[PDB]
Amino acid sequence: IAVGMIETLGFPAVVEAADSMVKAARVTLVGYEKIGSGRVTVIVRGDVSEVQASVTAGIENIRRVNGGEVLSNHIIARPHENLEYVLPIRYT
Amino acid sequence: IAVGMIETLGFPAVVEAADSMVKAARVTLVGYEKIGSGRVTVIVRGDVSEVQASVTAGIENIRRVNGGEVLSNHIIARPHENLEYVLPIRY
Amino acid sequence: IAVGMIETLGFPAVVEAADSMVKAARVTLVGYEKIGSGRVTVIVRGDVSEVQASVTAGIENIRRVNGGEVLSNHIIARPHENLEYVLPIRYT
Amino acid sequence: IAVGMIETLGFPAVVEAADSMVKAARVTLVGYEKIGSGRVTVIVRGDVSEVQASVTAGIENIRRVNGGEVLSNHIIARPHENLEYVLPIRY
Amino acid sequence: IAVGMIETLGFPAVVEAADSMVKAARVTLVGYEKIGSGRVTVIVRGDVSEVQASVTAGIENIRRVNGGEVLSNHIIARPHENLEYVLPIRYT
Amino acid sequence: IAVGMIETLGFPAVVEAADSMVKAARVTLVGYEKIGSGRVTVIVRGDVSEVQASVTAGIENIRRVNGGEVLSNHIIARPHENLEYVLPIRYT
Numbered sequence: 001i002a003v004g005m006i007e008t009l010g011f012p013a014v015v016e017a018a019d020s021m022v023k024a025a026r027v028t029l030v031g032y033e034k035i036g037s038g039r040v041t042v043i044v045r046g047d048v049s050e051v052q053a054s055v056t057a058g059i060e061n062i063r064r065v066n067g068g069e070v071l072s073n074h075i076i077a078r079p080h081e082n083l084e085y086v087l088p089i090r091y092t
Numbered sequence: 093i094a095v096g097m098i099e100t101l102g103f104p105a106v107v108e109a110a111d112s113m114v115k116a117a118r119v120t121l122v123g124y125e126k127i128g129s130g131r132v133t134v135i136v137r138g139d140v141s142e143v144q145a146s147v148t149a150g151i152e153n154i155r156r157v158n159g160g161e162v163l164s165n166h167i168i169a170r171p172h173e174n175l176e177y178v179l180p181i182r183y
Numbered sequence: 184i185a186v187g188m189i190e191t192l193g194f195p196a197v198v199e200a201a202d203s204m205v206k207a208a209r210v211t212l213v214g215y216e217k218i219g220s221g222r223v224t225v226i227v228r229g230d231v232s233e234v235q236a237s238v239t240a241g242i243e244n245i246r247r248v249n250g251g252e253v254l255s256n257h258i259i260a261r262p263h264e265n266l267e268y269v270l271p272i273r274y275t
Numbered sequence: 276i277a278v279g280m281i282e283t284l285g286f287p288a289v290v291e292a293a294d295s296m297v298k299a300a301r302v303t304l305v306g307y308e309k310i311g312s313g314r315v316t317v318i319v320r321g322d323v324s325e326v327q328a329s330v331t332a333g334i335e336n337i338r339r340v341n342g343g344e345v346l347s348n349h350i351i352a353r354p355h356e357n358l359e360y361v362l363p364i365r366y
Numbered sequence: 367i368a369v370g371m372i373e374t375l376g377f378p379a380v381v382e383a384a385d386s387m388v389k390a391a392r393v394t395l396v397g398y399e400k401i402g403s404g405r406v407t408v409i410v411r412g413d414v415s416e417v418q419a420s421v422t423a424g425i426e427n428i429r430r431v432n433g434g435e436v437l438s439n440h441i442i443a444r445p446h447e448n449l450e451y452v453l454p455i456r457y458t
Numbered sequence: 459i460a461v462g463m464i465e466t467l468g469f470p471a472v473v474e475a476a477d478s479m480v481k482a483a484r485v486t487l488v489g490y491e492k493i494g495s496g497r498v499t500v501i502v503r504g505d506v507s508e509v510q511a512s513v514t515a516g517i518e519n520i521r522r523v524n525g526g527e528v529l530s531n532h533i534i535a536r537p538h539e540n541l542e543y544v545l546p547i548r549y550t
Contacts, residue, residue, distance in 0.1 A: 019172055382534065
């Protein structure tokens with residue numbers, strides 16, 4: 001099950017990211033990760049083509065946030081099961 | 093139920109943002125989020141017109157905070173229900 | 184009941200802020216908030232004129248701190264009761 | 276048992292580092308450490324040759340993360356047992 | 367009872383600050399505060415003359431820490447009792 | 459009992475620091491301290507000459523870490539017992 005993630009500077013931009021992602025395709029938002037320096041990431045899971053659709057919509061719609069900025073983004077089609085136990089990418 | 097958000101650099105400005113928001117319209121302040129680098133966000137919920145009124149007043153009143161600064165802001169008229177269970181935008 | 188707050192870069196300056204505020208007028212120190220980046224705020228409650236006296240004394244006396252810096256400050260005369268439940272401005 | 280570590284700026288890149296590491300060789304991902312300033316490290320354990328294979332693949336695959344950056348990386352073939360009880364490099 | 371405080375960038379320098387302070391005079395180290403951005407403060411209590419002796423020796427000894435830096439420092443001879451209940455300056 | 463500490467920017471360099479220190483002499487690694495800004499310190503205890511040997515090896519071996527940087531370091535031969543109760547330099 002693919003994982004998609006968008007990392008933004010600022011929390012309003014991240015919420016737009018999460019909303020746009022779950023709206024644009026059949027993905028589940030499973031998490032929100034703060035790592036400091038104002039950097040925050042939202043994580044979704046779903047079929048690779050859906051997750052690809054989600055992430056693309058996310059990066060575009062953040063342009064509608066005043067003071068919005070995307071710092072990074074990425075999709076992994078088939079994450080190894082080891083990640084599910086160590087990183088916060090898992091269904092809760 | 094719409095969600096409105098103002099992110100400031102500095103805590104005094106966020107308090108003004110929160111105060112102004114709840115006073116300008118029928119919205120509820122539901123949260124305060126710290127993400128580091130001095131960045132703090134206040135979050136309100138309410139009808140989209142009320143939330144829109146709250147956020148514009150917040151951005152304007154932060155200007156009478158000594159050292160106050162708005163970094164970002166945003167409104168989502170109809171956030172997806174999934175957001176309620178993962179992000180701190182909930183009652 | 185008014186709320187006053189002074190935000191400094193550095194913890195020694197914030198302690199001077201708290202001390203000067205409770206000394207200069209009839210206000211109660213109710214809180215100390217850290218939001219990262221070395222930014223720290225002290226919060227007092229009291230009558231608006233007292234809180235105004237406190238905050239003014241605070242900003243001046245921080246000039247006596249070696250390496251002291253005030254980043255921001257603010258007073259709200261009559262905060263909405265909603266704030267009491269979400270923000271740490273409350274009588275503990 | 277060797278320990279391998281890749282530190283990145285940004286969380287998405289750290290996920291790729293972790294995924295690539297466990298896929299490139301017989302290593303176990305045992306941890307994720309945040310130390311502030313956006314710096315995050317993933318830690319694996321395994322035989323030194325496997326760990327060496329895992330870390331080089333991690334550094335290489337981070338390059339297909341939009342906005343990804345490696346800050347540091349390192350392998351210790353035979354870390355001292357004292358490290359296991361103090362640092363998050365264990366189980 | 368006076369309070370003295372030295373804030374450094376970096377943890378090794380704060381240890382030297384604490385050590386030097388308790389060795390230079392009859393003060394008690396009561397606390398260590400982290401506020402982010404590498405800024406850490408150590409806090410002692412004692413009579414104002416002792417506390418003054420402790421802080422000046424701290425500032426001076428930090429200079430033999432490789433990579434050490436003092437960011438700020440301060441003494442309050444008679445802090446208000448309200449401070450004891452809100453800030454980490456007391457005997458726990 | 460002496461205390462030695464090396465502070466690095468980045469976590470991989472700190473692990474090398476800890477490993478090199480416990481390997482180069484008869485010292486115990488007792489702690490790891492994060493204070494933000496990517497700054498992390500490892501702390502060992504032992505006889506002053508051993509601790510001196512450990513810290514020296516630590517700073518040299520960090521040159522073998524890709525992206526490794528030492529920000530500060532320091533040894534205190536005989537730390538005051540007060541520090542043991544306030545700072546994380548203790549046999550936890």
